[PDB]
Amino acid sequence: MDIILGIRVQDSVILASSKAVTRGISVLKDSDDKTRQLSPHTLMSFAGEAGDTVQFAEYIQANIQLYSIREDYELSPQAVSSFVRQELAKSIRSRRPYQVNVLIGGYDKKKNKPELYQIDYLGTKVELPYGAHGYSGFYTFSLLDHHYRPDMTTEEGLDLLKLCVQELEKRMPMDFKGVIVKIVDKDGIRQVDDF
Amino acid sequence: NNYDGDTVTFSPTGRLFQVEYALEAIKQGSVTVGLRSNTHAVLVALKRNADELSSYQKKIIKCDEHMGLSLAGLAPDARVLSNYLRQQCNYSSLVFNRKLAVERAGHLLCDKAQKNTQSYGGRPYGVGLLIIGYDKSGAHLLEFQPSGNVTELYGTAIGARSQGAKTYLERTLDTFIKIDGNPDELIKAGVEAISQSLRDESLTVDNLSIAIVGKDTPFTIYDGEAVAKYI
Amino acid sequence: GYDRHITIFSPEGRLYQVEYAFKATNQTNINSLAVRGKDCTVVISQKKVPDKLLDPTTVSYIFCISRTIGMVVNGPIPDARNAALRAKAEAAEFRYKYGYDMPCDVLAKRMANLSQIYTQRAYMRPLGVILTFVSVDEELGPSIYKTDPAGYYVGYKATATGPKQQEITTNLENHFKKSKIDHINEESWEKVVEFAITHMIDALGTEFSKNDLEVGVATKDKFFTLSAENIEERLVAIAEQ
Amino acid sequence: GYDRALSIFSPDGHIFQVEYALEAVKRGTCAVGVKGKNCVVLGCERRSTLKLQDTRITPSKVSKIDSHVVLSFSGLNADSRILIEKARVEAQSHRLTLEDPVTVEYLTRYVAGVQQRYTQSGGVRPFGVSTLIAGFDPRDDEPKLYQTEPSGIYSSWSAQTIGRNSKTVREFLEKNYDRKEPPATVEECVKLTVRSLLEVVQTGAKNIEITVVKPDSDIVALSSEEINQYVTQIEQEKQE
Amino acid sequence: TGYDLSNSVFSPDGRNFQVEYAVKAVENGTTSIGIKCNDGVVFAVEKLITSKLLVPQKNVKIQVVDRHIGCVYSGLIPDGRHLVNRGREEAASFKKLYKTPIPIPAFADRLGQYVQAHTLYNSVRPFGVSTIFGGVDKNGAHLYMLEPSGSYWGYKGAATGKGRQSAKAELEKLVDHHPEGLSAREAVKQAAKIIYLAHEDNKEKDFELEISWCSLSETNGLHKFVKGDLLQEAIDFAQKEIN
Amino acid sequence: MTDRYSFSLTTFSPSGKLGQIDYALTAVKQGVTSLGIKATNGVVIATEKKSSSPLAMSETLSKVSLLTPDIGAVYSGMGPDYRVLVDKSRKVAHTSYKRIYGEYPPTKLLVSEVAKIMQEATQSGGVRPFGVSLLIAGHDEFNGFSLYQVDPSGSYFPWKATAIGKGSVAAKTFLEKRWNDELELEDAIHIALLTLKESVEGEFNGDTIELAIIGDENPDLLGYTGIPTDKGPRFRKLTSQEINDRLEAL
Amino acid sequence: DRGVSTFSPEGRLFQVEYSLEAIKLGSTAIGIATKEGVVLGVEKRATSPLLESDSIEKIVEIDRHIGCAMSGLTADARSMIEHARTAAVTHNLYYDEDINVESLTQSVCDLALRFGELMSRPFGVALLIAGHDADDGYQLFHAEPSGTFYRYNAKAIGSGSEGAQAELLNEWHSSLTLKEAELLVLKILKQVMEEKLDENNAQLSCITKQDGFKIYDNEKTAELIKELKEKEAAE
Amino acid sequence: QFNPYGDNGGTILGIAGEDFAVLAGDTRNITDYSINSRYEPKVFDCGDNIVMSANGFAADGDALVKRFKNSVKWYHFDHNDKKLSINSAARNIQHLLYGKRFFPYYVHTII
Amino acid sequence: GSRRYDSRTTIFSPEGRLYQVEYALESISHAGTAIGIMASDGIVLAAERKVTSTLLEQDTSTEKLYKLNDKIAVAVAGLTADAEILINTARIHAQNYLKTYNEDIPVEILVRRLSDIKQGYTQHGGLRPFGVSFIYAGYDDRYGYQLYTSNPSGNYTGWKAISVGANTSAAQTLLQMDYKDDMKVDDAIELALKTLSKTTDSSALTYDRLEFATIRKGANDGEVYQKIFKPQEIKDILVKTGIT
Ligand SMILES: [Cl-]
Ligand SMILES: [Mg+2]
């Protein structure tokens, strides 16, 4: 898959992910949601090799849901990201590795803090204020470096995200058919239906 | 007594009671007769029903175009052993383009049964088999016991009341061995032999099971109105 | 009372199957003896061929384990040959792995450790044998090491095994009490064999023909058994003084 | 591996290990299940031989298998954890492959299948546990209540009890539960469940647990005071 | 007590009663013998004719191992067959690795260790056969006899089964009266006689004689069955001696 | 074949006793007396060389065994069981420690590993417990000198001084009167010889007594020079002559 | 103790003979084969009135052309059914056709004697396997834990079996209609059942060539019970 | 490097009539520019009124026909001597061929 | 064959009890008493060593109290060797959890894991159960201070105060009498020692016959400290509480 962005503002994490699915010659779909809810306050967006992406995302989702039922407790975003990293770090030395890159956006209800983790297919984890995978960072990071503030509102974060998407739509060769945007905050996960 | 808990235990007189108890299951089974001439070999089997609504349990199993057996005792064990014979007959054809000799088939059955008599956990086979066949050395008849003992014979019988048929064949030995090139007369001799083991019941159309193999005769089984000719 | 059938502790802290394996040891009714010279180690054993239909050349309880190591067994022949084959395999493997010939005491320890395992693991029975290993070791010199069904082993100045071991043992003990040395002070192995046979005759109170004995000799770099005619020469020398 | 056949037939056609597993269930604390018109209630006995217990952290008797299905039990507590874990894994495995949560009947069938397997596998003894599995199928408002036992047989129940003195509370339910008109509300259903346990329990204090399951993953456990109000109202009507 | 209920249990004597019970099965079997001659060995066996319905000459008891070893046994016939099958595997692997056909003493230990292994565990039953076997190798003729315990020795003559005492006495005469040795053709004749004489212990039913031999001069060191005119000549010689 | 004893041969009886462990302890009770005493600057372990025959060379049978350069062991009970435990203990010191950390294990952890092997023979399928009690003496940099007892059950305890086997009850009483926290190594050896004399019937000399110490580093026993940090083994087995010298001052 | 695969002195496997005793304790199941179809019927036998009887599933579909009824330790039947369903579907996958009823029965019966020290004990359940194929028409088999199977024109298994079998002896003829067979199963079930027979404690099913295997509704069976009552009162 | 496949040439032809069918094939067997045989039968009667030919690599062709013939034999054993219909044979052959999906039988089969 | 000698350690009695579990519990009832008491500001673990000697090196000795990680400790009653097997398994499980989630293992998850291991030995494998009962004292940020126990059956339960080993009946009555919910660690220390002092089979309770440990948020600010008491420190707390 192509473009996945993430930005952590004052009180929420915002994940933007492209809608296009291209199989070589044609664009098969223009409404694809490249994300899974792992728990009520944790969202994971993903991009990489076809098939492996969804297979990995659903496998993680199943494991976190299992943990939630067993303990009657939601794992922290930090804990979920560490679990995910280990799975990818295990995967990289397998017979056939998962070729999947992820962003994990979560709201920690204990600390009352949004958290954004960027993890590539090797199992390389970093906590960031804003992140991306693939070529998305090359276009967007210069804008985010300039405009980002840690005390931004969710509305300001969405406006900065629009500016990022506009720059991508101008300078990227591939038509990624716009983005689905989702917000993760204290009240859970919701989708911005107009973007 | 104290030495019949498993097959791995000899008694103080050198007996294997589990094997002897497996031998007893054959004596409870229905009678079946085997006999041969120089050209043909015949199996005759009295099939047993559960009641008047039930079918008559099949006694004869084909192993190849030139070989097959009749059973007496545990029918599932016969299925296991006959399946093994089918495989060995088939291995011989596929690998060596060679029909399996009846004598060699006996040796393979002996060795398969033996392993179940010397190891812990297992149990002996609870069935006796009469194998007939026509190979490169002519017609053959074998008697298999689950002790492992396999014996080549002109004629024999196994099952309940088999002693009557066995005595008859022992008298008729010189006559039926000479029935060459006459399948019907050899079957007649087998039907007359199995009749010496009947009491109260007689041979009906769904009671009797006959099989034959010979010089220019593939192993074929006759049941139903195909055996009314011999009643 | 299943503590008597398998190798588990009885209430007295005893292993009855081990004790009964020691009794199986004397089932052959054969007595062996081993002694050390200056340059050699000699082992003698009684030979009994009760059946005239037997080929007497094939009746033996002495085994050539390796070039340097010989082994005499006290116990039934099936268990004896079981132990022999294993010892041979172990000795060969040792040389391959470590690049030198397996010492007599090390092989004894190895076989003893195997015997110990049978006294601890239930599925394996003890072997009903006592194994006397002999060599002229390149480091320790003349060597006698003996293993039993308990998994015990130790080195010996001299030793005796069998139904009448005590009579032979006391006879040997008394000799070494006189001489005050740990071996037979003799140059040739021929005279050490003559000593061994003489002291068995004295201890048991029986005379021997050439066919009543079986002799093994260990020297530097080889162990070998004597023929009936080699033993006859030995018996002639004893009688002539 | 240890292969010994522990569960075997006896001359009279009984598998004693399975029957002795039922005797362990008979020893366990009483559990009861009652389904209303739009809910299922699971009631559970807590023996008051153990005080100085920390009730915050002590394993609760009713366990969520998924967000929409619960499991209670009577018998060996340690054995029940193995069934609950397997059930929870299977529930997530079903969501992963079928893209739909388990039906209550499916989950029951799975647990019952595990229990059966342990009655004819070598080297293992049967589970000393009977279960009550309750909930609502996805996008369905019909209440579901099933029972399993060590043998592996399972069946659906309008109301059922298991464990010690379950004969007495089943006697109560058989005369007090009408099939033509089940407990129409949550209140009526909880009341009938508390009433049934009060036939057996002793004190109505911390000895009764109640869990209410409603459609669309709406599961809540009642507190001590909420249950104590039912206990108070039942006996005040009884004084007459 | 209880020491005889399980294989590999030492009794308080130091005995394995299960092995001793296997011997009883051997003693119950038909008589079989072995005679070591000048340049080979002769094997013979008593085959009881249970019924007229047994096909004469068909139920062969003596078994070849490799091309140079003969095996005959008394007791549980299937156990004997199992032992020979193993013997054939051992003889095959030996020849595969070392090129030369397995020597007879080497082969004897291969059977010996295998039979002994079935006295080490309670999960297996001892062999219910004594086996007489041998043949010709590079060092000449060898005859062996192997018991349920795993015990074996080399023999000048050997016998086992129901008529073993009778046979042994006859063999002991041959050893005394022929210190220089016996020819292969003499040994076939003598083998026939000994089986006929040993048939007095099984006198109720009549029997069928079966003989085989390996001889350096007479069979080129290969195992062969005695057939036709040479078999009939030995039967006639045997029948003449009993009358 | 196959090992078809995949079940425990040691089980709880109705009274809560593990029969096979108790019986193993009984076998230890019948065994020859051995003891251990800890001093300020060392540890001593000692036992009687009960020779089975006078024709046997009792020097070839080592009852006191080096496990590591700074750890030694002695036993009471079944000798063969001891011998295989020493083999396993030496190996585990390498596999589970030296090949990982590049140094020999501390006394308490090697004891822990031996204990684990003995515990497994008490629960695993188709085996009996070990019929020995071990006394393990040793030194390491951070724990100093130490002495441990290990029983058939796998349980182990540290001691200032103790005795096991035949006359342990009397020997432990003797040690209680003599032991103090100011003993030098020579004082402990003296006490060890005094204590051991009580349980010995026959000959009492350097040839019938086996005695070893954990004491100062022995650079003369290292086998090489040139590395300052390698100063040699603290385990030393006393010679026949060295024992007899201390029996004159007895 | 003693081996699980041990033979008795009479030449019978102890465990197999004991499992047959468990089947005698089981609820009654009856099958009747006609030229118009095979009928299968069972006693449900709910242990309590609070047990919802429609969850008692003692008649089961194996394929469209094969049904099955059970009696004994019914939990044991689940893995047998699973195997049967798999075998039926697998054979269709390999051969693009329906599997013969006998071949399906044989496949199930191969599991029976796979016990020892494989599963730890025989199955404690007997099966009536009914079906249709083109070669042998409408068939009814009785599959035991011995590994033996008999074909039957009619058969009863479970606690009322010998009483029922004697009744089936008199009543069965080669010209029975499907409707006649339905009533006959209901009649004989009513005879051997402890409780009074109705649509909630007994269940009917049938297999026809046209419509395949069908479990009857409680409303459909209720009408056949009422039809039975009237025709018995008719003389 | 070892090449497990080869090409034995040949050509086969099947035609379905109204109440009959023919399966024809040339009898020449080749490698490269050499003739191995001028008469090596390629079309086989497999029993049950079915004829088969597996043309291409003759080793794989002979193996497949041998296995199908064997499948017919075991179909009779396992299903009471039932005649294997042509459609059922076809499905059975698909499974024989697909069983070696990742090391294929290098043949074009016609029945 | 081998069946003859099999005790069958994993079977039900006719009454539906597990023979070996019951007999293992009987073993445990002869072990030294261990007591756990949970307060608002910490947990106490007190345990009696079994009939010691004057020649036992006490300062380097550990038979009762073991550290599983920095937040969780256990008190042991039963076979010490058996306990150490399980303790090492538990220590690994805690570190596996820490490696995976980068958070310390919650107390109940560790307890459940060990308890499930014990359960396995009662249902399959034909081996004898572990003759051990644990008291788990621990802290995590979800439930705070927690006390649990597990026994050879693999069943575990949570407690405010609990005893295992010898004289648990007498000990539990005394704890039930004097325990209150608003109690503090210093009070709980006193209760634990007073309870052991009354239930002990020894003539008097001295420092050399005790092992003692506290888990306190008495660690400078927002963290938890485990204190395994030294012999001299046990002697001091015995004088402070007025027992010696
Ligand atoms: Cl070793
Ligand atoms: Mg043993």
Author numbering:
A (entry chain J): 1 to 195
B (entry chain E): 3 to 233
C (entry chain G): 2 to 242
D (entry chain C): 1 to 240
E (entry chain F): 2 to 244
F (entry chain A): 1 to 250
G (entry chain D): 1 to 117, 125 to 242
H (entry chain L): 1 to 111
What did the published study say regarding this structure?
The eukaryotic 20S proteasome core particle (CP), a barrel‐shaped multicatalytic protease, represents the catalytic core of the UPS. The CP is composed of two identical outer α‐rings and two identical inner β‐rings with total 28 subunits that are arranged in α1‐7β1‐7β1‐7α1‐7 form. Three catalytic subunits β1, β2 and β5 present in each of the inner rings confer distinct caspase‐like (CL), trypsin‐like (TL) and chymotrypsin‐like (ChTL) proteolytic activities, respectively, with the active site threonine at their N‐termini. Given the vital role in many cellular processes, the inhibition of the CP constitutes a promising target for the treatment of diverse diseases.
Subclass II is a collection of novel cinnamic acid and cinnamalacetic acid containing GLNPs exclusively found in the promoter exchange mutant. Thus, the main compounds 3–5, which possess the complete 12‐membered ring structures but contain different aliphatic tails, were investigated for their inhibitory potential against the ChTL activity of yeast CP. As expected, compounds 3–5 showed strong inhibitory activity with IC50 values of 27, 73 and 107 nM, respectively, which are weaker than that of 1 (19 nM) and 2 (4 nM). As shown, compounds 3–5 do not bind to the CL active site at β1, because the structural conformation of GLNPs displace the peptide backbone of the ligand from the proper alignment with the active site cleft. However, the electron density maps reveal that 3−5 covalently bind to the β2 and β5 active site Thr‐1Oγ and develop hydrogen bonding interactions with the oxyanion hole Gly47 N (residue numbers are allocated on the basis of the alignment to the β‐subunit of Thermoplasma acidophilum). These prearrangements facilitate the Michael‐type 1,4‐reaction of the Thr‐1Oγ to the double bond of the GLNPs, located at C4 in the 12‐membered ring system. In contrast, GLNPs have the highest binding affinity to the ChTL active site at β5. In addition, the P1‐alanine side chain forms strong hydrophobic interactions with β5‐Met45 and the P3‐threonine moiety is hydrogen bonded to Asp114 and Ser118 of the adjacent β6 subunit. While all these interactions are uniform in each of the bound GLNPs, differences between 3−5 are found in their individual aliphatic tails. As expected, the yCP:5 structure shows that the phenyl moiety of the shortest ligand does not form prominent interactions with the protein side chains, which is in agreement with its low binding affinity, resulting in its 27‐fold higher IC50 value compared to 2.
